[PDB]
Amino acid sequence: GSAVPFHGAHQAGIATPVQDRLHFAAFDVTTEDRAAFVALLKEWTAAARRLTAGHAVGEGAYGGLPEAPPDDTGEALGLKPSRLTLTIGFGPSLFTRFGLADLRPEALADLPKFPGDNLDRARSGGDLCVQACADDPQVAVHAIRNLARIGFGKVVVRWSQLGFGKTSSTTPDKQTPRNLLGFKDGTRNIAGTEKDRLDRFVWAAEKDGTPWMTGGSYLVARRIRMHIETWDRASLQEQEDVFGRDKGEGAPVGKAKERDEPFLKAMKPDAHVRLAHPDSNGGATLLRRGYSFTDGTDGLGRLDAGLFFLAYQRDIRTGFVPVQRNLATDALNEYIQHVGSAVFAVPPGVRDADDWWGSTLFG
Amino acid sequence: GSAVPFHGAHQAGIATPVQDRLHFAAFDVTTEDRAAFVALLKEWTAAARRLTAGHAVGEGAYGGLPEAPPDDTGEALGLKPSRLTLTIGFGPSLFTRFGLADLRPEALADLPKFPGDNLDRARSGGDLCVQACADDPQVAVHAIRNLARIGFGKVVVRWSQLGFGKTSSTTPDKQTPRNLLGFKDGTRNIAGTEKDRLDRFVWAAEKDGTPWMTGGSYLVARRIRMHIETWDRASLQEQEDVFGRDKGEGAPVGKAKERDEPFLKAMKPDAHVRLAHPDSNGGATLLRRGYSFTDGTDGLGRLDAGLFFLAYQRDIRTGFVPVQRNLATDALNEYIQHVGSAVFAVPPGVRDADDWWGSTLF
């Protein structure tokens, strides 16, 4: 299809179909004035309604007064909506402003330091995030560029990441994408069709303790670099032993088909799938929604590439934290390094044309 | 999703319709052994025939000996060819090696310094290049990664550039794309169907003085940063005056339609289109084939944005050089800065299955 509805009980971009491209930006707030920030949230919501329907922001990209700057920067003229979704989230650091310290959710937990972390502070944290997903990367980039412009003076861009998954024009919808290590990635995940599993593992409930967050979710972002040239020198058997699945079909060891249920005891004890599986983690289950990245080459001639990992969950303490803790001895650790991190509370949806991002928090 | 043929009198990736994505790499050569370098060019050609047809390199991505690394890294399994083209070029620095000094073409000129240049030496130059274009970014990355792997020990990657979307057109029958300043870019180019114009302005000829280059072209690459904070506070009138075309339709000033011919005297004397047009440059004409990029933030609160400019021509001295010299007074200079540069000789095409990249030189 061509557009995804913006309004709902939940924000789009979580349980809605996974689009081909990502532009993820983290923002820091520069104003101390609560009223000015609320005004910004309203203006951003109005812009998002236009962007996600394939229209220009404000009075448009051309045809206004000649002596004024155009309201929209114009680089998406002639493109389609491209299934654009715009999803906003609030970082822990936002709650030190505007008198919000007692409204930080307990489920918005700070992450511990994990073994092997090498986090770049410049590509970590942030007061706010906007996740822009679309099938055309120019549509996503135009949305972030225009939100940043509207906000100039009240927010700045802290860090930015582009990503890619499948190209839907050429690749069937039911084919699992492969990551840059060459393995199928996403076989055993929560799907957007699974309403009850979303209620159990993804959406915040009123009884969880934070009423303004009901119908929201919690997001963990990790920029994970792969050591591509080292991986590519490993034997086929070494690569398959790291995961617990074969490379060609992606079946669990000792099984024949991709979607055959794993037998964990046949895998090596420190294989990635064995460590990450819910049965190894007291039932903990995540919605993964990440994207591959390739940024260029570093100063040594090596490919700067990896996985921009995104996970949504009902509570960070019972989702990401236990699972990532269990990966302390993962065989995959030889080939990856976590180099960026951030966490966000993703509020409930925009209910109708009069509602605005963050209305349950700000009032 | 279809394949573009690999063999021909010319290399594909020049006159070919412009694909959605770019992955460009420049390599330096680390071996002094001519025979070893020739062996590499042949192995690379064999791999390119597989990649451009959507097949894995060598013996495949899986199902070999358990104790060996796979011949193909595997991340393009199950994907279509996606109009992948692979175009090789040789830089001036190559010709100091392997006894090639006397074969360097005259048309492969070093560029002069231009006012306003701020060139990063680490993301400039290179002994050789591979331009990978495709509609699927994963297919383009897979191609460059596998070539680099095959070349381990004989070549190293010097610098690379990814382009997330095209800012050029060789197909005037299709919609012209916009650059990150919001203007259509590619209206007046050279089309892939204009055989006479390609022969006059793009392909090298025997008579030009370097026989091994007959059927090849010359490439200039320029990495250009855009001052988007400065641009985004400019008025609509200011923006349109810079180019000489209106923003919405992209018509020449005064006219109604994109493809109506420019009337240069109605444009400001420093307008980009007026300065760059062939009639302002003694007839000099280029094939433009560039892409947009964004490489994160700038560390000062803003998105980074730019354009990776690529131009093909029959002789650098009669194509890019005169045009860029004429741009010394361009209104656009207020909003851009050139920060990387490289030139390459792009050899003729691979004629058939027994031929190989660079065979006319070696």
Ligand code: HEM
């Ligand atoms: C570069 C980093 C990573 C790569 C390449 C990677 C790759 C994979 C692959 C190939 C699978 C198996 C197919 C599938 O079910 O999706 C998998 C499964 C999984 N991964 Fe990872 N992964 C990475 C990081 C992480 C992280 C950081 C977490 C969580 C903290 C995680 C959690 C999981 C989970 C929960 C499963 C499903 C296990 C099951 O229920 O069968 N992964 N991963």
Ligand code: HEM
């Ligand atoms: C960021 C840098 C640049 C931007 C944003 C830009 C933008 C544009 C735009 C909007 C047009 C009009 C539509 C078209 O006919 O394509 C154009 C035309 C053109 N540009 Fe540029 N350009 C840039 C750099 C350059 C450079 C470096 C050169 C050559 C040295 C160049 C050569 C041309 C030529 C030859 C034309 C066609 C003129 C004609 O025959 O009508 N441009 N450019």
